[PDB]
Amino acid sequence: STVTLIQSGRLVRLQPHERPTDSVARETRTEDRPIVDKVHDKLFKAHRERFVHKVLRSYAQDDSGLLTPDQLRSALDRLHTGLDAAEKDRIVARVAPAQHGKVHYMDFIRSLES
Amino acid sequence: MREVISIHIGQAGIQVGNACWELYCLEHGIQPDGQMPDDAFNTFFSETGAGKHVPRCIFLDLEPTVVDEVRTGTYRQLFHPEQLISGKEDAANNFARGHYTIGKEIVDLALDRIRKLADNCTGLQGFLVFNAVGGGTGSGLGSLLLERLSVDYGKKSKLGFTVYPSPQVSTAVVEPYNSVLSTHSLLEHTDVAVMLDNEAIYDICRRSLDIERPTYTNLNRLIAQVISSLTASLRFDGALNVDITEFQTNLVPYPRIHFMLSSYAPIISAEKAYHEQLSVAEITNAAFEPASMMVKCDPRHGKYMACCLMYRGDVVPKDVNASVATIKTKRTIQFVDWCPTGFKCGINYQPPTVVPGGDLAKVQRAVCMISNSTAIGEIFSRLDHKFDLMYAKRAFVHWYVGEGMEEGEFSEAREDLAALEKDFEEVGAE
Amino acid sequence: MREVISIHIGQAGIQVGNACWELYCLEHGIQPDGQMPDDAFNTFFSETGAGKHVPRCIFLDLEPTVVDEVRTGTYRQLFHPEQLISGKEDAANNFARGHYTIGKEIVDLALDRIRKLADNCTGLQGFLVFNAVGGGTGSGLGSLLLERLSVDYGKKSKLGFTVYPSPQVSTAVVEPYNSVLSTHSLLEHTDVAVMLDNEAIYDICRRSLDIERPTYTNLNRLIAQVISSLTASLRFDGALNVDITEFQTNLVPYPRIHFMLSSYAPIISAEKAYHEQLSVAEITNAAFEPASMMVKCDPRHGKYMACCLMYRGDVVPKDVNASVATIKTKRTIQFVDWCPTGFKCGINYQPPTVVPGGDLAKVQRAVCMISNSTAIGEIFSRLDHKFDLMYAKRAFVHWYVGEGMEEGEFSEAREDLAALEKDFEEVGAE
Amino acid sequence: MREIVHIQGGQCGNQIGAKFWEVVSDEHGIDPTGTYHGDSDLQLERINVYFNEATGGRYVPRAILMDLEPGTMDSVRSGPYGQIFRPDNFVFGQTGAGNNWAKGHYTEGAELIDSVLDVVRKEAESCDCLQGFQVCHSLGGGTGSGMGTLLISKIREEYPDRMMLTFSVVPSPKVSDTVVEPYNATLSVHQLVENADECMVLDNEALYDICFRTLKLTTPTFGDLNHLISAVMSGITCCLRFPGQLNADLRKLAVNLIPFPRLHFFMVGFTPLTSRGSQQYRALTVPELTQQMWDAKNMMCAADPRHGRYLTASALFRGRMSTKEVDEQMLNVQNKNSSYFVEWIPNNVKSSVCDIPPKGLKMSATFIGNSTAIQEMFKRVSEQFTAMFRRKAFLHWYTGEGMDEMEFTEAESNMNDLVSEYQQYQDASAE
Amino acid sequence: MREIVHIQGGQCGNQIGAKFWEVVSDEHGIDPTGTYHGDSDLQLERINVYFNEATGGRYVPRAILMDLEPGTMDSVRSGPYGQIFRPDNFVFGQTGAGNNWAKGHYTEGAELIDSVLDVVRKEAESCDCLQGFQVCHSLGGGTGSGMGTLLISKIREEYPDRMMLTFSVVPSPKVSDTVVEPYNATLSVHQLVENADECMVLDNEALYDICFRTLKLTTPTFGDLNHLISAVMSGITCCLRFPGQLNADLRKLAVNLIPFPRLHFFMVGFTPLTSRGSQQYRALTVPELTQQMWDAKNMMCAADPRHGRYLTASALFRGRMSTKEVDEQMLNVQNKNSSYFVEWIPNNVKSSVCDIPPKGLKMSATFIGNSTAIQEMFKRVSEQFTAMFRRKAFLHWYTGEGMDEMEFTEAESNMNDLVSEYQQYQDASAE
């Protein structure tokens, strides 16, 4: 399961062992860049922002936006991002809860917006 | 046994090939690593002794970036590294550059790899060439490869799923130029050419999928669904099987007239799904809707000559016959006087697989209508004046001349397109 | 198999349709989701392969709010999304706006969906058009759609359950204007027009239901119960079945005279229920009481021409005959000289189902008396003065003129309601 | 999905519009940063009527602020709800109009009107469907009245079919602020009669009288009057934004209210306006709200209805009520006061009901009455305009801004013709 | 793997090149010591386009610095990113050209041109595949204009097929820096027409206007102007360096922009340029970007596009955006301003999309317009050249360097013929 990295126009094809695998889904690394691109396209390019906000608020019973990571995974599944379980876990781990699942939908949307 | 060799030329060809091969991997259960956890994959994949499946495809481009994105993405372990062929200098939207100077060695290597791929196929239904009419790489190198394939392979059926410039909206300036040149080239090489327009597919996405910001990935997903519906009869059994050889013999009334409108149905998002019946008659009507055409060309202006319907999923001959009878009795749809039947129905028991992360919903039935109709002369009429409006001033002509063309090539291409217009008028008229 | 297509136009039409469809779902056991845990629903619902029953109804309105209330309400998965048709701009209580400028595209789409719905019905007993005479959407768009249906569908029986303005109490100012216009329209299109007045139903709720604060929900529930009593013979079997086609021939003496009083019995709350016998004779006398009329029109001023009785529940034919014989021997009830029979009795074995949360009690017997009587010309006489009083000063005339209407149309409408006055006088006369 | 383009003009108009947007944001649960915090689906259901969704979750009002001096909208931006508005919607000049209608309509409004119409067109084209425009401003002022009339004329030319609603603060009868108020009002009424489809007439002194007699306030600043006007402006259109048992849009109100097009001036009132002291002592009943609604003091207009005759009157209720109760109450009012109601109109009541009352109030009701009483207000404005115009006092500035002296005669003649309409339809007999 | 050889000429060219290389090093995560510190593989994807790898992780620019005086590149080396450049690529004379094109092209340029071509050839031979050369310099200066044109001619002779891209700082219209600016510009334009395949015209006064009106800076040094120029030069080649949804190289842009070989002069603009105050207030949307692109103030050339007609216009967008939105926006722009677009070209817009926006920006776009408005720029420079040449003012400085008088006449004739080309295709009607 090697990863091909193009450095100065040539294919390095680095081994998976060398990669740290931060398990954060950072768009800087080209390994997770297509995942972040897919999430961004599905959330913003394909889905209307009002629909996304409504979906995220629906899980927020407190109406303060505070959503658990499991609720974020359920929201992504409802939004049909198409990611696998591990990819969804990484996209959720992109944000970090404040006290106990205190990440809110506006923070998550800011994380995946640009 | 029923192998089909896929060629993807240019940025558009490669970008629709990404969607096509994602769709095929999902349909056959092939993981992106290459191997899957019978023999329905043989049409698109060849299995090795280790159990790994490698597709029978060839990614051809004179620009390194598009192919290198494939080399870097998730399908880096799937495709053959040498099958991905990359140039050094792009054709720069110049048909001359892609057909006369840069394209020579690239197409030579392309023939080499295509020959290797064909040597691995017991049977060969034909070639599926996906390129972009309107760009130097797609037009020039695609035309050169098509000419070489016609020279050597001979009677193998080459189905060209070309993307033509939209009527008003466009992204290139010399697009009419290289479009007319490539059209002159492929009028005499490809067996069945399928027209596709970005404006039309944008309209389809905006109205049916409710996407206010459609993108190339969405367009390519729709195109991949169309091609998968086309090839489903090769890979999965069903009543009224259709073959690659059978598409021509039921669709191409005359050798010159082989350009095809395509329409898929239903195109519904996940949200709006399961809210209507989506029965066979309704989806056939949706397929025959002019708004569902993947080409910005109103069929009401012209007359249908042939219509091949590919049904997928829970479809029964009773239903297909009733739907086709209703379509015939419909007064809006007008057929030519010399083709009383004009219909080729083919059913398949495999419902279209849904790409996770895509906008299409899981529908139990689908119709892919590929129609030969004289209305398609309208798009040629549009390009014929878009080209000559610049060619009257000989704008950008020096660019094409610099890479080894002449005014004669432009003149001959434009004359051939006018002759094609005349042929369409003649066949449409009684 | 004996399908009736339901149409609901305007705020009042859609809001009485809410109660009507709640009642039909409760009567046939159809859950709000769409499916129920023989073939008695076919008259109002069409079952799909998945088991979901979708009502054969069409919600037409130029204002989005009322239809969006349905789209978001409990009945969001029951109704068909395209069947709910929403406009962009309200008619603004302008008949010209609802009939000449805004209503055209909406009625075209309405006929499209109506054609689709009628295709799914083997037979077709008729249409049930629920609208509000006294508002532009109800008046203008309703009249336009009725013209469309009369011309194309033709001999299908259309029952228009129209609500005219009350004598004194009203909520609109141009209500006489658009009421006169829509009556001018529907005198010639509907086959049986059922008259309703909000003041009369308010009085019914005040005295019989003891509701000191009646509201539109209560009014629409009463109307829905009346219509369910009308249609009980189509869906449930019983002695003396009466058909939609039978109503006109048993009730319409002459083509223009087809406006009908409707009266339900009993109207008793639960607390007052099971405390009186509610025998057939007593409920019949209550139905013939002047106060039980759902139109502010005293039957005593006129003479009954025909009376059609719909009995629901444990009703025996000798009891209906004895009650109706006592009615005939009653001195207060007066028939015309030329209709000695004047009675159309029809019984059904299904007692009226009660909507939970409503005020109506579970009564084992029910009567809906729909009577053609010459008295009803009095309400038209009221509107004929309400109209000309404003028309003398031509108040609010410019509003109607702006959307493509003329002085001639106002004059002709007034002429036609005067003609209707003379027609009622002449049917009353010897 | 039927949008309204709000415009604020002059200092008074800008302050009132800022208060109105504060009230609307409170109703829809929008914090001053634009994020939704209302905890109600109905609030976001029709938020597009007044707001547009920004790049994030922020909602930007569809409001356009006009001025010739920057100080007023500087104060507006520094106010509690100044940051919701888009900065591109703040159009200002540099020299304020010296209470000169001629300066605000001809000299200094001419250059800024191009930018104003550009912003208005940008806001209108974004709307899927446009109900119309609402202009909040004050008669009797230079930049306010001048730019309001000019922009109303321009928008009438551009969108003849779209609804035009105006909230004009007519100069007060008894205590006047500036000297040239009768001049400005006379010039503005001529334009408002011809262009604006629907107009509300408001008075600072009428608002003061209602706030001392009903609200019993002690030190009512201009903010309280602006709050009352904002409540009326919300209640007039709450049917568009919230589901109603018997809804009625702006065009429906206009059709049912305006008997003849030139008689489109209306007096408004809001109920229940109750003092802080009598909150518990009053009981919220529909008959109570109707009794307060038909009181002469409840009108926000100086003209008392008793002298004139009600041509028409609409009442938009908000809250869970019985339509039977409302209809019976208003029919009883008409029967009781039939002398004050026009005879040749059988029903002078346009009753509408919305299912969502304003926050804090269980139910409310806004009243819009077209009565011949406003004849006396126009008569008083004429009695001031003629007094100054007979000597041409203060007239040389207007003459020097490039408007002809015959225009004053035109305006006074048109306003007096409107007075004649009101009087003759007051004394008109049936048959 | 399509390498670009950068060349800086003269004081202005060297300063612009230093700014551009610092910008590119920032964008590719290259610290002033040459090591990569970006933590993003996208930065190292196509770093070979501009840099070569050293023994360690160091990356050296493929840049060649030119001057006849050493002080300017002493300042360049003293700058923050002066140590990245290979010291062998600094080519200096000892006596600078006294704003004399003749000195920089014939007398003092002749000795240094051999070393310049040696360095250029050494840098070009190391390239795997060579897209071409980009030369940043200023018209109206001795060493810059003269040496740059001489080097461009030599490189054209050596590598005909390879692209030549030029960023020329044409003398500003309203304020002239040096007296001999018309002479140098007239002599350099003649060389650039014949040799340069692609040319971008920049004016310092236009840059001042854009940085004072859009960025709203009150004291902009030359660093800000070089910053804007560097942003344009980065954005023109970002498609070569990053993956794009619809990628387009320099040759593709030249093919889609140049209808006829002599009409290769372009005006450029970069969006979004936002003032610090309105950064939060501005909305990053494709329509907003297009609106800012097509504004005449956004052009970095003095000539405004309104006077001329757009022969062609390329738009290289950056960011994760809808190709549908992009194409629809520019089609709408064409339809709205069809009067400003040439009729005999059905589509005057070349859309390119790159998936990687500039650092910090969600979206961006560079605009390259081939329009006949540049005709007035050339006309003004010729108006100055003729006035000075009629009386031979300062002509002896050029004559004593071994340049014939007839060369000035030939250059002016060529430049007037180019003006004639632009005017003739501006007023050229289809059919």
Ligand SMILES: Nc1nc2c(ncn2[C@@H]2O[C@H](COP(=O)(O)OP(=O)(O)OP(=O)(O)O)[C@@H](O)[C@H]2O)c(=O)[nH]1
């Ligand atoms: N439908 C569709 N069309 C595309 C897509 N990508 C590119 N195109 C079209 O393809 C055309 C250009 O393709 P190419 O010729 O391959 O571009 P290239 O790879 O840079 O090669 P050259 O343009 O010849 O230099 C454009 O005009 C687009 O209209 C896509 O994803 N979907």
Ligand SMILES: Nc1nc2c(ncn2[C@@H]2O[C@H](COP(=O)(O)OP(=O)(O)OP(=O)(O)O)[C@@H](O)[C@H]2O)c(=O)[nH]1
């Ligand atoms: N019985 C009954 N009548 C109603 C109800 N709702 C409205 N009405 C009557 O219907 C009349 C107006 O109906 P519509 O034309 O549908 O009103 P709308 O939907 O706003 O359409 P326009 O008035 O034409 O703009 C009013 O005068 C009411 O008397 C209701 O719920 N029950």
Ligand SMILES: Nc1nc2c(ncn2[C@@H]2O[C@H](COP(=O)(O)OP(=O)(O)O)[C@@H](O)[C@H]2O)c(=O)[nH]1
């Ligand atoms: N209700 C209310 N009225 C005001 C306010 N400020 C001023 N006014 C009144 O509005 C009238 C007209 O002033 P205005 O037109 O705004 O002056 P202009 O802006 O210079 O044209 C004055 O007579 C004031 O009495 C306010 O904040 N609220």
Ligand SMILES: Nc1nc2c(ncn2[C@@H]2O[C@H](COP(=O)(O)OP(=O)(O)O)[C@@H](O)[C@H]2O)c(=O)[nH]1
């Ligand atoms: N944008 C920019 N322009 C400059 C800079 N320095 C000089 N210029 C302009 O370049 C023009 C020509 O000067 P230049 O070519 O550098 O003189 P030379 O080096 O002796 O040839 C002058 O008119 C200056 O206005 C700079 O740092 N940035």
